Amino acid sequence: RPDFCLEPPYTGPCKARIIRYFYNAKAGLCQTFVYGGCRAKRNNFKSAEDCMRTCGGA
Template sequence: MRVEAMGKTRYTTKGKGSWGFNKETGRCEEFIYGGCGGNGNNFESKEDCDKRCMNHYPKK
């Protein structure tokens, strides 16, 4: 979807911003969730992801 605001053109997706834990980086990272399928590694906020995942996996 193309969105124009304050003289700038931006492109968005229909998906929703979500957060998931990336074992490779050892951090919670934002991604676009399209709403189909999914798993337990899908959080509404970085804080929720951090609370759930950071204690279970060591930082890299």
């Protein structure tokens, strides 16, 4: 698995609130969180599917 698969949910400096998903290594699966709306990191997906296709083990 990559390193980015373990990044924290970085909302960004934007004060907006947008439901996004991320691989959460601290749970071991793809989960939802609130994201800001700028400076999206690698640890940021549009669905659990897409997260899985990207980083879902193998």
